[PDB]
């Protein structure tokens, strides 16, 4: 049992205050101005700040090992445009040196996900940085089915002289995949009602079926406004849930996204516009999408921006009209909600996971450093 | 409600005249000599010319983005000779800067369609330039199945060392495809007869069936006269509707086309004869086909010729025996008819869509400019 | 004549103070407590911060156009491991949309340079963002000869099945180039003291000659400690001046660089360690190298980090032991010195160029914005 004393506490779902946080059984037990417990180990946080761990809703950390070279990346199975059966989990390296660096940047939970080479790329999972054993890191698995639109999938397969080489082809590949999923489901239901054992189980079809049954969302990479809309059209044609990844030009169509309640994981933003489809990338997108009532989270898209610099990217958005309150939300409670985990992470409230970061100062002040990180109430990082 | 006053009105379906057009609920409500409405907003067109929007029955605008480079084109899924399932709609960029230029050239509606790389290319859609959301632009979707004959498909697959590399092979690929569609339809009918559920739905086959059921026409690219006749033989063999795209050598066989009432979308004509199959291209084809009573429309085949210059290409045919009246019809009522949209677009008549272009003088006078464009009664363009 | 009044002025070469700056003839005329001038246009900077323009000593802005695609990059002539004759100047697009963004980040002067594909890559130039005509932007041309060691050159030519595919080969290519330069110089002096006019002028050799005569430094890309030492060994062998680019592991050998007075343009630092040779990259490098007395500047290596975010990267190093005073120096006075331009840019002093930026608050505060930018006393940007 741990009693944190006298911090400036930032619960996020409530206003900041000077006070105390009691942790037991891996959870936040009590939050408030004054707390006593004669049997709790007391950690004196006088002059420090206490935040929830930051949550990155889209990351390739562990998949693209740091300090080693591009050749070793495990993040894109770019040998087949339709790889839903592969799992980011099976490529995740919990000893990647990026992970300790991310903890030193205050980040505790991420959605690990394949990249954007494939129209259908594979399964993502939500993990916490709590163990070198990936199975102990699992919060939610599978968490989503990654898909991709725009320049990346058509570049990769165009180079292979293979379908898709155009945006039309990318959409066709995905539509063709789900058409087959539906056939597969009908065959399953036919077997079940004939009381016969299904003998045609198919790993790729099974994952498709999960999406169609809304067990997990599609996680749809799209930058240019028309690619975002195409992703939405396909989701609606097949009746599945979606999240837009990046959504670089989401601001151009923010009214539609707001009305439909499609969430957007924006970012990477503190970065060069390397592609044509990125030409209209802007940090103003945060203020713009918030103003129009779209639910957003902010990603580093690690390795594009190192996860350790999540607070650096967030803070910088203050130069482009974003407010601190909101900036904290898109790193905490918003990504948690987008990942279906708002009852567990992203804020300091009784009953939620004790994922807590002790900062020397406000996290958006570049003088501030991470002193301690706790995940489920277990210290996993200490500065020095 | 909008009242256009004192224009030289060109309804196309009747002779031009000095008068007025009243617009309400997106439609042409009244057209005649003296319209009065004290509630309508009055737009004074003294000294101006009022036309319907031009209609290009075959375009790749929005698929091949302007000012960007060939490599980014979305118009040809050239990785498989049979791609009926892909849609031009899914590669169409409503922010393509060619579109604002097409409006400045008086063009308001087009058929967007895949290119001619593939024996079976994918689906077209009729759209208007009314929004940045492609779903709001849709008039008719799907509108046709694009197919291709002659040098282009055999070159593309010939380079790939893949069937088809000859005209024989090209016809074979298409005939094979439709044989498969009939088989697919036979299986559905056999399933129904047997009281069994059908579980072999196939996206590629479904589009074929729409064609065989005459829900949509084949839009068949053919230049050389023998290629045009092969297209017709296949259409007749399988009992589907067709339109001929380009029909460069249609004039050599115009009596057959007129008898069978095969429409031809001629063009591009204001263009270099880049290929052997284009050696006999001639702007005289307009006068020739119209003389023999073939239904024709004129395309720019954008981007071969920019859509902004549709009136330029048309005006230029006056050097080769085509009359002004007819030239206007092949940009308005004829393409509207060929697209199955003659009761919505192509003319200024009560009940039709209020797609209207204010010109400074006659569109075939190289001094004339577009001052305003309305689509469905909404201003979408105004000269600076 | 322009008189900026009542900003918090940051001269860099002395403490910040509340006061005035007077500009005439493209230059800083006066800096002080209370300045009057009847002919000066008054610009009231109450509540504002006045800084020199930041200077990035190593950039590929304009060479790698933003918003367009890697395919259009003009930054690496990766078809020949020895291209000293090419000029970053000849691939620079003054209309790159990154440039207006760099101004909005308070950066006014950069050295444009080829990348690190080639053991010998081509010539750098110092420019200012003052014009859409590159010739009017030129401050110093040529400013340096770019060379590269470590993984990049051996990867590029290795993939081409061409020398160099190893570190041994990269060093061999450069040594061989300068051996040829020396021969060239001897042939010129043989012609010089005969009757004959020299008939074997060679662009590639001419540039090499400038380096050996110490007219311009070698600008040497190196990350791993041994690569930095190899670069120094070659410079000493042929007697030329050098600057280390990146110098990722410079901190491991800082006493030597200090002793030999080798400057280091550190960075990119706010970035992922994409390579084996970047495994020990650390923002702690700034504090370490300063402690040990190495002259350093900080680069974004744009586009690796956008130049607009130059202050973001610098501010972030305070999280790794670096102090604000030093962080401003490595963005202003130190890069000016490394470029041989400390008489002209990098600080607010009488006689220096009027490259000045009006900030809404301190540049290391993420809420602060660039309101105005002057280059040579002409306003080139307004928020």
Same domain, B204 and B308: yes
Instruction: Give residues with Cβ within 8 angstroms of B259, minimum separation 6.
Output: none
- List CB contacts (< 8 A) between C304 and chain A: 272
Q: How was this entry determined?
A: X-ray
* Phi, psi angle pair for C249, to nearest 5°: -105, 20
- Give CA–CA dist A104/C250, Å, rounded: 24
> Would you say B111 and B144 are in contact if contact means Cβ atoms under 8 Å apart?
yes
- Give CA–CA dist C69/A29, Å, rounded: 51
- Give CA–CA dist B137/B59, Å, rounded: 15
Nearest to A315 by CA among C299, C315, C103, C283: C315
* Phi, psi angle pair for B228, to nearest 5°: -65, -40
- List CB contacts (< 8 A) between B78 and chain A: 165
- List CB contacts (< 8 A) between C98 and chain A: 272
Chain pair A-C, CB pairs under 8 angstroms: 81
Residue to mutate among C68, C305, C366, with most A CBs inside 10 A, is C366
Largest CA distance in chain B: 70
Instruction: Give residues with Cβ within 8 angstroms of C111, minimum separation 6.
Output: C56, C57, C58, C59, C124, C125, C126, C127, C143, C144, C339
Distances in Å between the alpha carbon of C224 and those of A238, B263, C59, C167?
52, 70, 20, 11
- Give B255: exposed, middle or buried? Use CB within 10 Å, 0-12, 13-18, 19+: exposed
- Give A36: exposed, middle or buried? Use CB within 10 Å, 0-12, 13-18, 19+: exposed
Same domain, C1 and C69: no
Same domain, C259 and C355: no
Side-chain-side CA neighbours of C272 within 13 Å: the count stands at 25
Nearest to B77 by CA among B46, B108, B117, B107: B117
Residue carrying the six token digits 């936040």: A28
3-state secondary structure at position B163: coil
If one counts every other C-beta atom within 10 angstroms of the C-beta of residue A381, the result is 20
- Give CA–CA dist B46/C337, Å, rounded: 69
B116 contact A CB<8A: no
- List CB contacts (< 8 A) between C271 and chain A: 306
* Phi, psi angle pair for C162, to nearest 5°: -130, 150
Distance from CA of A71 to the nearest CA of C (A): 9
> Would you say C247 and C288 are in contact if contact means Cβ atoms under 8 Å apart?
no
> Would you say C270 and C327 are in contact if contact means Cβ atoms under 8 Å apart?
no
B78 contact A CB<8A: yes
Q: What are B40's two structure tokens?
A: 């309508």
C69 contact A CB<8A: yes
A167-193 helix and A225-238 helix, angle to the nearest 10 degrees: 10
**Domain around C233:** 53-343
Q: Report CB contact under 8 Å: A367, C68.
A: no
> Would you say B358 and B48 are in contact if contact means Cβ atoms under 8 Å apart?
yes
Give the domain CATH number at C9.
2.30.40.10
- Give CA–CA dist A210/A240, Å, rounded: 9
The stretches of chain C forming alpha helices (DSSP H) are: 97-104, 134-137, 151-159, 167-193, 203-212, 225-238, 254-260, 285-291, 310-316, 324-329, 333-338
* Phi, psi angle pair for B137, to nearest 5°: -80, -20
Find the length of chain C.
Answer: 383
Same domain, C41 and C113: no
Same domain, C34 and C63: no
DSSP-derived secondary structure letter, A53: P
Number of domains present in the structure of chain C:
2
Nearest to A20 by CA among A37, A11, A32, A28: A32
Q: Report CB contact under 8 Å: B201, A190.
A: no
Instruction: Give residues with Cβ within 8 angstroms of C51, minimum separation 6.
Output: C10, C106, C328, C332, C348, C356, C357, C359, C363
> Would you say B66 and B302 are in contact if contact means Cβ atoms under 8 Å apart?
no
> Would you say C281 and C270 are in contact if contact means Cβ atoms under 8 Å apart?
no
* Phi, psi angle pair for C284, to nearest 5°: -65, -20
Nearest neighbour of B199 by CB, restricted to A157, A190, A252: A190
C278 contact A CB<8A: yes
Cα B207–Cα B213–Cα B216 angle in degrees, nearest 5: 60
Same domain, C85 and C209: yes
Residue carrying the six token digits 């061989």: C176
- Give CA–CA dist C297/A376, Å, rounded: 43
What's the Rg (C-alpha) of chain B? 21
- Give CA–CA dist C148/C132, Å, rounded: 30
Distances in Å between the alpha carbon of C189 and those of C196, C197, C216, C312?
10, 11, 21, 51
Instruction: Give residues with Cβ within 8 angstroms of C102, minimum separation 6.
Output: C61, C110, C129, C302, C306, C307, C308, C310
Q: Residue C292: is the preceding peptide bond cis (ω within 30°)?
A: no
Cα C321–Cα C326–Cα C328 angle in degrees, nearest 5: 120
A229 contact B CB<8A: yes
Residue to mutate among A193, A212, A226, A277, with most B CBs inside 10 A, is A226
Q: What are B239's two structure tokens?
A: 């009992």
Which element (helix H / strand E) includes A379? strand A378-382
- Give CA–CA dist C114/A18, Å, rounded: 53
Same domain, C58 and C48: no
Q: Which residues pair with B127 in a beta bridge?
A: B110, B138
Round to the nearest angstrom and report the end-to-end CA distance of chain B: 24
Distances in Å between the alpha carbon of A25 and those of A376, A382, C230?
8, 21, 57
> Would you say A81 and A162 are in contact if contact means Cβ atoms under 8 Å apart?
yes
Same domain, B265 and B200: yes
Instruction: Give residues with Cβ within 8 angstroms of C375, minimum separation 6.
Output: C53, C108, C128, C129, C130, C353, C354, C355
> Would you say A122 and A75 are in contact if contact means Cβ atoms under 8 Å apart?
no
Same domain, B221 and B369: no
DSSP-derived secondary structure letter, C197: P
DSSP-derived secondary structure letter, C250: G
DSSP letters for C110-178: EEE---SSSSEEEEEEEEES--SSHHHHEEEEEEEEEEE-SHHHHHHHHHTT-S-SSHHHHHHHHHHHH
Same domain, B306 and B271: yes
**Residue ranges with strand state E in B213-369:** 218-222, 242-246, 264-266, 296-298, 356-359
Same domain, A151 and A7: no
Burial B156-178 (b: 16+ CB within 10 A, else e): bbeeeeebbbebebbbebbbebb
- List CB contacts (< 8 A) between A302 and chain C: 272
Resolution for this PDB entry, in angstroms: 2.1
DSSP-derived secondary structure letter, C14: S
Question: Which CB contacts under 8 angstroms, 24+ apart, belong to B222-226?
Answer: B222/B148, B222/B149, B222/B150, B222/B246, B222/B247, B223/B149, B223/B150, B223/B151, B223/B247, B223/B248, B223/B249, B223/B275, B223/B277, B223/B278, B224/B150, B224/B248, B224/B249, B224/B277, B225/B249, B225/B250, B225/B252, B225/B253, B226/B167
- List CB contacts (< 8 A) between B83 and chain A: 163, 168-169, 172
3-state secondary structure at position C106: coil
A287 contact C CB<8A: no
The stretches of chain A forming alpha helices (DSSP H) are: 98-103, 134-137, 151-159, 167-193, 203-212, 225-238, 254-260, 285-291, 310-316, 324-329, 333-338
Nearest to C315 by CA among B274, B315, A212, A313: A313
Give the domain CATH number at A289.
3.20.20.140
Same domain, B236 and B381: no
């Amino acid at each position: 049992k741990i009693l944190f004393k006298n911090a400036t506490v930032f619960p996020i779902t409530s206003r900041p205050f000077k006070g105390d946080v009691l942790v037991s059984n891996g959870k936040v037990e009590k939050v408030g101005e004054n707390i006593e417990d004669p049997d709790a180990e007391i950690v004196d946080l006088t002059g420090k700040f206490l935040f929830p761990g930051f949550v990155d809703a889209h990351s390739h950390i562990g998949l693209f090992e740091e300090g080693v070279g591009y050749y070793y990346s495990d993040g894109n199975e770019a040998t087949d445009p339709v790889t839903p059966h592969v799992k980011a989990l099976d490529g995740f390296n919990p000893q990647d040196p990026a992970i300790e660096r991310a903890l030193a940047g205050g980040v505790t939970s991420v959605m690990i996900v394949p990249g954007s080479a494939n129209p259908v790329g594979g399964q993502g999972s939500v993990i916490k940085f709590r163990s070198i054993i990936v199975e102990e890191c699992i919060v939610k698995d599978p968490a989503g089915l990654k898909m991709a639109f725009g320049e990346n999938p058509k570049r990769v397969y165009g180079e292979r002289k293979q379908t898709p080489s155009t945006r039309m082809g990318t959409a066709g590949v995905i539509r063709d995949y789900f058409t087959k999923v539906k056939n597969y489901m009908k065959k399953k239901e036919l077997a079940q009602k004939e009381g016969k054992e299904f003998t045609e189980t198919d790993l790729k079809m099974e994952v498709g079926e999960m999406v169609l049954r809304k067990k997990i969302p599609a996680r749809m990479h799209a930058h240019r406004a028309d690619d975002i809309l195409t992703a939405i059209r396909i989701a609606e044609e097949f009746g599945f849930n979606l999240v837009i990844e990046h959504g670089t030009e989401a601001y151009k169509i923010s009214k539609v996204l707001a009305e439909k309640k499609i969430p957007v994981v924006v970012g990477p933003l503190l970065t060069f516009r390397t592609k044509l489809e990125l030409k209209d990338l802007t940090m103003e997108t945060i203020a713009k999408l918030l103003k129009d009532g779209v639910l957003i989270a902010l990603m580093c898209d690690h390795p594009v921006i190192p996860l350790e610099f999540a607070t650096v990217q967030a803070a910088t958005a203050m130069r482009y009209g974003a407010k601190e309150e909101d900036l904290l939300k898109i790193l905490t409670v918003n990504p948690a909600k987008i990942l279906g985990l708002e009852d567990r992470i992203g804020s300091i409230e009784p009953g939620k996971d004790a994922d807590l970061v002790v900062w020397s100062g406000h996290p958006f002040d570049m003088k501030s450093v991470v002193e301690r990180v706790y995940i489920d109430g277990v210290e996993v990082f200490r500065r020095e």
